[PDB]
Amino acid sequence: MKKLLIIGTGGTIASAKTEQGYKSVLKIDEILKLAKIKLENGYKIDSTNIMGSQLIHPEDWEIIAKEVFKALDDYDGIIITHGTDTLAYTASMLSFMIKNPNKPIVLTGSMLPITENGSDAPRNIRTAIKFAMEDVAGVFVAFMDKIMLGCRTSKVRTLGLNAFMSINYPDVAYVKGEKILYNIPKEKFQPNGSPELDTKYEPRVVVLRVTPGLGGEIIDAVLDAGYKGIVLEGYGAGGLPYRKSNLLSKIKEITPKIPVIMTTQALYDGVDMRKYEVGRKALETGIIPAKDMTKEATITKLMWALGHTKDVEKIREIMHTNYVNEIKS
Amino acid sequence: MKKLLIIGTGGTIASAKTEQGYKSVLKIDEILKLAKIKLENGYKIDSTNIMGSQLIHPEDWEIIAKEVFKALDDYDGIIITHGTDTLAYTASMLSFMIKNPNKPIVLTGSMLPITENGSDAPRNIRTAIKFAMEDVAGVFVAFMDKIMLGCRTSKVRTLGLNAFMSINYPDVAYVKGEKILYNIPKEKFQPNGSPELDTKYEPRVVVLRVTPGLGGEIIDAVLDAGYKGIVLEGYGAGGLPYRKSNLLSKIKEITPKIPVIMTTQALYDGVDMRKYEVGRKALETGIIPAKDMTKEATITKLMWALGHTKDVEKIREIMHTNYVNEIKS
């Protein structure tokens, strides 16, 4: 009946405790063996390893997108095991690089190595397999029995097993044993159009936390260092100091040439740069609101957008296009 | 019986909706009047305004600490109204600038202006007054009926009224009408020693989010721009790329001269740089773990520490000293 591909990429899920700490040591065949995954029953799993890796690099996104893209032809469902710390960047970036995928692409990981007592790895793989067997299409994350839209996922903690949340967006579904309870209607994830691959990206995006003290001298430094986009983890007021501070005036000097995106240091509820006068002053300088996007969506989307054009009005239109429900319309 | 001082500083709590957006317009006397606060019954409230402000600047911390410090002599309790976006930076910084305060110092704010329907401002002020009437000492935040240790508070969302959480640390208490339920024993917040004022700080700390793509060229740029400390919002693996990446090797070149602190982009559970080999490699470069500290504690503590010395071993010892339960021992 159904054919699944599981792609290994590294991560805690590929790791074992050593005398030098956790170390990425397992290929996907050993993960599947150590997590006691059934390779059949209404399906057949094939497995492959892309390329000691804990962390994804932007180059790896192009590699993974090409392999996933070629595989849509031969598989009903595609699972990617991945390090938790950068899984949400990968999930978001594939959501822009693979247009109209016509099969489920499901990323997962673990907080514990398989071989540690109480590991979450077997359960997360099993969840991902179950959802990958669904007649749906898009890029999803499977974690702690939840299915979440890839471009809306963030890692919220470093120890607790319920480590990924859907930010400012509903979960897709919840998997209890063999039952899938759709939180968003299944009919909403049907394939539309033919898949396309677009791997253009510019990686030199720098993300800053807006703090008291942060001066315009940083904006000078990041331009001197060659960076092409700036993400700010700003305030819910949505604005910057324009008094005892050159930050807003130094940004206003560069917004015609460099996209400056305003997201939040706060996790939940998004940025509204219109509610406060201080926000409206930040907008008036040409700072581009990230609205309800996650950090990981904001960042990967801007890298992808800069790969297409350096025209800041065109970047604004790309960032505010709702491609795959990464952002409100 | 008891004397309370309420200090105004600006914020949403001081704001009103105008045709140009929310605007800071109210002095503390008008806030108290519009929120219908009782200025007596077992107490007397005095009020004062420090110095159009939504956002605190590091300079304001010294001003507020001097005024709060002088006021310990004449008041049983001190309340500060403050903008929510930078309240947690202020609460943390006062926790290092005011040693062994012998009275409750309680910061609060609101998500809604007083004059907006359903405002949280009256309730937050009332909570802060109630806790300020307690025979305890330290720096606390009052929000949505909770009392939280100041140096453990973060703003987690931009719209929901329950906007502040206690991070990796229990709440101090919960206030239901006239009842205070102590979550940590009251006896644990008794005054010890005589209050001291220490307002030394270095503001040029830059906070970066660790992303895929982030190169060592940023470390060069921030040194050229004169910054004296770097906070990284890193990964739970606790490490950096040392492969297809010069980030870790450029940081290893500067850690003898510049403190580089590793905290998390994730909100909850802290950094453990020993669990993973990649973390141990980051430690071996002399990156200083922030452990369980909040971003706002990490950042203000480093600014305060740099105000005392530029010796990176002495900064490490300061950062890992548990002064006021900002960090685990």
Author numbering:
A (entry chain A), B (entry chain A): 1 to 51, 54 to 331
Please share text taken word for word from the publication where this structure appeared:
The hyperthermophilic L-ASNase from Thermococcus sibiricus (TsAI) was previously shown to exhibit high activity and thermostability and is promising for biotechnology. L-ASNase exerts its anticancer activity by hydrolyzing L-asparagine (L-Asn) in the bloodstream to L-aspartic acid and ammonia. The subunit of TsAI consists of two α/β domains: an N-terminal large domain (residues 1–184, consisting of twelve mixed β-sheets and four α-helices) and a C-terminal small domain (residues 207–331, consisting of three β-sheets and five α-helices) connected by an interdomain linker (residues 185–206). In the N-terminal domain, the active site pocket of TsAI includes residuesthat are highly conserved among all types of L-ASNases: Y22, S55, T56, T86, D87, K157, and T12, which initiates the reaction.
The mesophilic combination of highly conserved residues involved in catalysis and substrate-enzyme interaction was restored in TsAI by the double mutation D54G/T56Q (TsAID54G/T56Q) that resulted in a two-fold increase in activity. Superposition of TsAI and its mutant form TsAID54G/T56Q showed stability of the fold for these structures (the RMSD for the Cα atoms does not exceed 0.2 Å). The most significant difference between them was observed in the conformation of residues 51–57, where two substitutions occurred. The point mutation T56Q led to the formation of a hydrogen bond between Q56 and S15 side chains in TsAID54G/T56Q. At the same time, the D54G mutation destroyed the network of hydrogen bonds. Together, this led to a change in the conformation of this loop that was additionally fixed by the formation of a water-mediated hydrogen bond between the S55 and D62 side chains. Moreover, the part of this loop (residues 52 and 53) has no electron density, confirming the increased mobility of this region. Overall, the experimental data show that the increased flexibility of the loop M51-L57 due to mesophilic-like replacement D54G/T56Q is the key structural difference between TsAI forms. The significance of loop mobility for TsAI enzymatic activity is confirmed by the two-fold increase in activity in the mutant form after disruption of “redundant” hydrogen bonds. On the other hand, TsAID54G/T56Q exhibits a sharper temperature optimum curve and increased time-dependent loss of activity compared with the wild-type TsAI.
